[PDB]
Amino acid sequence: RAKAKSRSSRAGLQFPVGRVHRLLRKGHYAERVGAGAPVYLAAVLEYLTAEILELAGNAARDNKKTRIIPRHLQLAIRNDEELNKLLGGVTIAQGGVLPNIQAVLLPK
Amino acid sequence: RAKAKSRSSRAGLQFPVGRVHRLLRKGHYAERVGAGAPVYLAAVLEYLTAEILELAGNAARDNKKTRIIPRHLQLAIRNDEELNKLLGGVTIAQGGVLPNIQAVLLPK
Amino acid sequence: RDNIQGITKPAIRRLARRGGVKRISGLIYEETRGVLKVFLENVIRDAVTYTEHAKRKTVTAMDVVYALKRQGRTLYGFGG
Amino acid sequence: VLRDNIQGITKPAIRRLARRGGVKRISGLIYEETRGVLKVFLENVIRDAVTYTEHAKRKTVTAMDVVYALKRQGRTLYGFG
Amino acid sequence: PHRYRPGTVALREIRRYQKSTELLIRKLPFQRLVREIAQDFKTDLRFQSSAVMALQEACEAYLVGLFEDTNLCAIHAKRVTIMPKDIQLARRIRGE
Amino acid sequence: PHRYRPGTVALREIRRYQKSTELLIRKLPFQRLVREIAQDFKTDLRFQSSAVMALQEACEAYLVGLFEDTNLCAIHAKRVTIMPKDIQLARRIRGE
Amino acid sequence: SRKESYSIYVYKVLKQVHPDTGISSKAMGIMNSFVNDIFERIAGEASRLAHYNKRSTITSREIQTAVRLLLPGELAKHAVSEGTKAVTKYTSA
Amino acid sequence: SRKESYSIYVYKVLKQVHPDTGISSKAMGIMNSFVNDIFERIAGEASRLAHYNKRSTITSREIQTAVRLLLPGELAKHAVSEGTKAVTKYTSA
C-alpha cells in the first residue's frame, strides 16, 4: 500500500478538497458530483480569501497595528469598487461607517 | 387487484396529487417525502387558484365581457391588498397600469 | 408598556449624528419610534416561528440569523 | 455592422411613455438621459442572456434565456411562459 | 381658428394612455438596436421573434416605473417640470 | 467665557461618532423592550445572551442606513432640517 | 414528447366558480406560470427548514410552517384550515 | 461534539500574505462565515443550471459559468484563470 498523499497537496491548494466534496454531496445540490468541481471551487475560494486578506493587512499596517480587527475589514471592503458590488447586502458587526460630509453643510 | 381510484378522489381535491408527488421526489428537496405534504400543498394551490379566478371573473362582468383577458387579471391583482403583497414584484404583460392622477395636477 | 420610552432622545440623536444629519426637527422622534417598532415586530415574528417549530423554549442566535436572512439581509459575526 | 441605431428611439415615443406614467410637463433634456438609462439597462440583461446561450452551445437566443436572465435580477415576467 | 389652452390636451392624453394597453415603441427600430448591441459579445447571433417582444415589454415597464417614481420626487420640490436631477436622485435612493 | 457658534459642536460630534465604533443603544432598555414585544406571541420565552446582541446590531444598522438616505432627500428641497415627510418619501420610494 | 400543464385543472376550477365564463389562452399562460412559481417557493423553504433541524423527511409540519411564513396572515389561516381538513379526510378515508 | 471550521486555513493564508501580521478571534469568525456564504451562492446557481439542461452530474463547466454569472468582470477574469490552472495541474499530477 502506497503512502497516502492529500489531494490538496497534489493540486497545491491549502483548502480541504475532501471537505468541499463532502459538503457538495450532503447538500443534495445534485445526484452526481464530478471530480473537478471541488478543486475548482477550492481554488476560487482560496483566491478570494487571499484577495481580501491582502487589503486588510495593508489597512492594518497603515493604522500602525499588528492584529487585524473587524474595523479593518470594513474599511477594506467599502473602499473597493468591485468588492463593494459583491458584498453590498452584507453588514459587519462593529464595522461602523466611512467618514463623509455633504459640502453644502460645511461653513463658508 | 381491487378497482383503482385516484387519491384526489379520496381527498376530494381537483389538483393532481400524483403529479405533485412526482415533482417533489424529482426536485431533490430531501431524500424522503411524507404522505401529508402533497395533499396539503395541493389544497393550498387549489385555494389560491380559486381566489384568483373568482376575482377575475367578477372583474369581467363589470365590463360586460364574457371572456377573461390579461387586463382583468392585472386589475384583480392590483386591487387586493393581500394579493398585491405576495405578487408585488411580478410584471404581467399587456396588463398596463391603474388609473391615478395626483390631485395637485388636476385643474383648479 | 412604557418600555418603548427607553429609547431616549439622546440615543436617536447619536444615531442621526452617525448618519451625518446636522439639524433635526423635533417631530422625528415619534416617527423613528414607529418605524423601529414595526421592524422589531417583523423580525421577532419570524424568530419565534422558528423557535416554536424546533419545540425549544429558548430563542437562540441562529433563529435571528435565519430571520434576517429571509428578510434579505445577511449578518456576519454571530454564527452560521 | 450597424454603426448607430440608438437614435431610432424617437422623442414622441418617450413622451408617450412619460404620459402613461402621468407626467404632465417634460423638460427638454430628459431625452438623452432616458436613452442613456435604457442602453445601460439593456446591456445588463443581454450579457446574461448571451451567457446562458453560450453555456447551452446553441446559436439562437431563446425567450427562456431572457426569462431566466430577468429572474436572476428579481424581475420575473409573467405572460411568455 | 380654434386652439386649446396649455395642458388640456396633455391631461386628455394621460387619461387616454392609462386606459389603453398597446406598445408605444416601434418594433423594427428596437429589433435593430437589439441586434446592434448583442454583436459586441458574439457574432452571427439569431433572435427568436418572441425574444424581442419580451425585451420590449421589460424595457417599457421599467421606464414607466422609473417615471412614476421620478414624479413623486418631482412634486416634493414644489415644481411641476421634471428634470434630470430627479431621475438621478431616484436612482441613487433606489440603490442602483 | 468662550462660546462656540451654532453648528461647530454638531460637526465635532459628527466627526467623533463617525470615527468611533461602539454601540449607541442602552442595553437594559432594549432588552426590556424585546422581552415586552415577544410576550404577545408566546409567553415565558427565554433568550440567549447573544440573540439580544444580534437583534441590536441589525436594528442599529437599519436605522443608520435609513437616516443616510433621508439626508439626501432633505438637501434636495434646499432645506437643512430633516422632517417626517422626508422619511415618508424615502420609505415610499424604497418600496417598504 | 407529450407536454404537461395545469390547464385542465384550472378549467375545472373555473367551471366550478363560474360555470358560464371561458378563458383565453393568454390568461391560461399566466395561470400556468403562477402555479410553478408558488410551488417552487414553498418547496424551497420547506427544504431549508428540514435541513437546519437535520431531518431526512419532509412532513406536513414543514409545509404548515412554510405556509405560515410565506403567505400573509389572512391567507395563511384559511389555507392551513382547509389543508388540515383535507389531510383529516384523507387519513380518515 | 466537535465543530469544524476553516480557521486554520485562513491563518495559513494570512501567514503567507503577511508573515508578521496576526488576526483576532472576531476576524476569524467573520471570515469563517463569509466562506460559507459564498459557498452556498455558487452551489445554488450550479444547481439551477444543472436542471435546465436535464443533466444529472455537476461538472467544472457549471462552476465556470456560475462564476462568470455571479462575480463582476475583472474578478471573474482572474478567478477563472486560477481555477483553470488548478484543475490543469491536478489532472497533470
Short mmCIF file of N, CA and C in Angstrom, two decimals, chain G residues 19-63:
data_model
loop_
_atom_site.label_atom_id
_atom_site.label_comp_id
_atom_site.label_asym_id
_atom_site.label_seq_id
_atom_site.Cartn_x
_atom_site.Cartn_y
_atom_site.Cartn_z
N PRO G 19 -69.60 28.84 -13.84
CA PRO G 19 -69.86 27.88 -14.92
C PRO G 19 -70.23 28.50 -16.26
N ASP G 20 -70.31 29.82 -16.38
CA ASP G 20 -70.73 30.47 -17.61
C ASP G 20 -69.63 31.26 -18.31
N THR G 21 -68.40 31.26 -17.79
CA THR G 21 -67.31 32.06 -18.34
C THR G 21 -66.22 31.16 -18.92
N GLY G 22 -65.53 31.67 -19.94
CA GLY G 22 -64.43 30.97 -20.57
C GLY G 22 -63.14 31.76 -20.36
N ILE G 23 -62.02 31.15 -20.76
CA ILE G 23 -60.71 31.76 -20.56
C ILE G 23 -59.85 31.67 -21.82
N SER G 24 -59.21 32.79 -22.16
CA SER G 24 -58.33 32.89 -23.31
C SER G 24 -57.00 32.20 -23.05
N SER G 25 -56.34 31.78 -24.13
CA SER G 25 -55.03 31.13 -24.00
C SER G 25 -54.01 32.05 -23.33
N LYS G 26 -54.13 33.37 -23.53
CA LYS G 26 -53.21 34.29 -22.88
C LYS G 26 -53.38 34.29 -21.37
N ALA G 27 -54.61 34.21 -20.89
CA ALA G 27 -54.80 34.12 -19.44
C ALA G 27 -54.35 32.76 -18.93
N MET G 28 -54.58 31.71 -19.71
CA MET G 28 -54.13 30.39 -19.32
C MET G 28 -52.62 30.35 -19.13
N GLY G 29 -51.87 31.06 -19.97
CA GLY G 29 -50.42 31.07 -19.79
C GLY G 29 -49.99 31.67 -18.46
N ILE G 30 -50.65 32.74 -18.04
CA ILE G 30 -50.32 33.35 -16.76
C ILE G 30 -50.71 32.42 -15.61
N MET G 31 -51.87 31.78 -15.71
CA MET G 31 -52.25 30.85 -14.66
C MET G 31 -51.30 29.67 -14.58
N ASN G 32 -50.76 29.22 -15.71
CA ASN G 32 -49.82 28.11 -15.66
C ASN G 32 -48.49 28.52 -15.04
N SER G 33 -48.00 29.73 -15.31
CA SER G 33 -46.73 30.14 -14.70
C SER G 33 -46.86 30.46 -13.20
N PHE G 34 -48.02 30.95 -12.78
CA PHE G 34 -48.25 31.25 -11.36
C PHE G 34 -48.10 30.03 -10.46
N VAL G 35 -48.66 28.89 -10.87
CA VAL G 35 -48.58 27.68 -10.07
C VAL G 35 -47.14 27.20 -9.94
N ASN G 36 -46.37 27.24 -11.03
CA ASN G 36 -44.98 26.82 -10.93
C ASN G 36 -44.19 27.73 -10.01
N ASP G 37 -44.53 29.02 -9.98
CA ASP G 37 -43.82 29.94 -9.09
C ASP G 37 -44.08 29.62 -7.62
N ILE G 38 -45.34 29.61 -7.20
CA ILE G 38 -45.60 29.34 -5.78
C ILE G 38 -45.12 27.94 -5.37
N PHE G 39 -45.26 26.95 -6.25
CA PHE G 39 -44.76 25.62 -5.94
C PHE G 39 -43.28 25.63 -5.64
N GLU G 40 -42.49 26.34 -6.46
CA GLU G 40 -41.06 26.35 -6.20
C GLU G 40 -40.71 27.10 -4.92
N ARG G 41 -41.40 28.21 -4.62
CA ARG G 41 -41.09 28.91 -3.37
C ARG G 41 -41.34 28.04 -2.14
N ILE G 42 -42.50 27.40 -2.07
CA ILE G 42 -42.80 26.57 -0.90
C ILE G 42 -41.84 25.39 -0.80
N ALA G 43 -41.58 24.68 -1.90
CA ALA G 43 -40.67 23.54 -1.76
C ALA G 43 -39.28 24.00 -1.31
N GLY G 44 -38.84 25.17 -1.77
CA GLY G 44 -37.54 25.67 -1.33
C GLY G 44 -37.49 25.92 0.16
N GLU G 45 -38.46 26.66 0.68
CA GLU G 45 -38.46 26.97 2.11
C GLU G 45 -38.57 25.70 2.95
N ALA G 46 -39.41 24.76 2.53
CA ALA G 46 -39.53 23.51 3.28
C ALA G 46 -38.21 22.76 3.32
N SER G 47 -37.45 22.79 2.23
CA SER G 47 -36.16 22.10 2.24
C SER G 47 -35.18 22.76 3.21
N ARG G 48 -35.17 24.10 3.28
CA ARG G 48 -34.27 24.73 4.24
C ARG G 48 -34.65 24.38 5.68
N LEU G 49 -35.94 24.45 6.01
CA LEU G 49 -36.35 24.07 7.37
C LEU G 49 -35.95 22.65 7.71
N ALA G 50 -36.14 21.72 6.78
CA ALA G 50 -35.77 20.34 7.06
C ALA G 50 -34.27 20.18 7.27
N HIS G 51 -33.45 20.87 6.47
CA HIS G 51 -32.00 20.74 6.64
C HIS G 51 -31.50 21.31 7.97
N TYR G 52 -31.97 22.49 8.38
CA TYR G 52 -31.47 23.05 9.65
C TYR G 52 -31.74 22.15 10.85
N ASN G 53 -32.87 21.46 10.89
CA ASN G 53 -33.14 20.57 12.01
C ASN G 53 -32.50 19.20 11.84
N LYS G 54 -31.79 18.97 10.74
CA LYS G 54 -31.15 17.68 10.49
C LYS G 54 -32.16 16.54 10.46
N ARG G 55 -33.14 16.69 9.57
CA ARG G 55 -34.17 15.69 9.38
C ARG G 55 -34.09 15.19 7.94
N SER G 56 -34.41 13.91 7.76
CA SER G 56 -34.34 13.27 6.45
C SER G 56 -35.63 13.32 5.64
N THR G 57 -36.77 13.64 6.25
CA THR G 57 -38.05 13.60 5.55
C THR G 57 -38.79 14.92 5.65
N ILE G 58 -39.64 15.17 4.66
CA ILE G 58 -40.50 16.35 4.63
C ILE G 58 -41.90 15.91 5.02
N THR G 59 -42.48 16.58 6.03
CA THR G 59 -43.79 16.25 6.55
C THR G 59 -44.67 17.49 6.59
N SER G 60 -45.94 17.25 6.92
CA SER G 60 -46.93 18.32 6.97
C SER G 60 -46.52 19.45 7.91
N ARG G 61 -45.70 19.16 8.92
CA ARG G 61 -45.21 20.22 9.80
C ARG G 61 -44.34 21.21 9.04
N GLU G 62 -43.55 20.71 8.09
CA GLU G 62 -42.71 21.61 7.30
C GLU G 62 -43.58 22.49 6.42
N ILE G 63 -44.58 21.89 5.79
CA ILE G 63 -45.47 22.62 4.90
C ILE G 63 -46.23 23.69 5.67
#
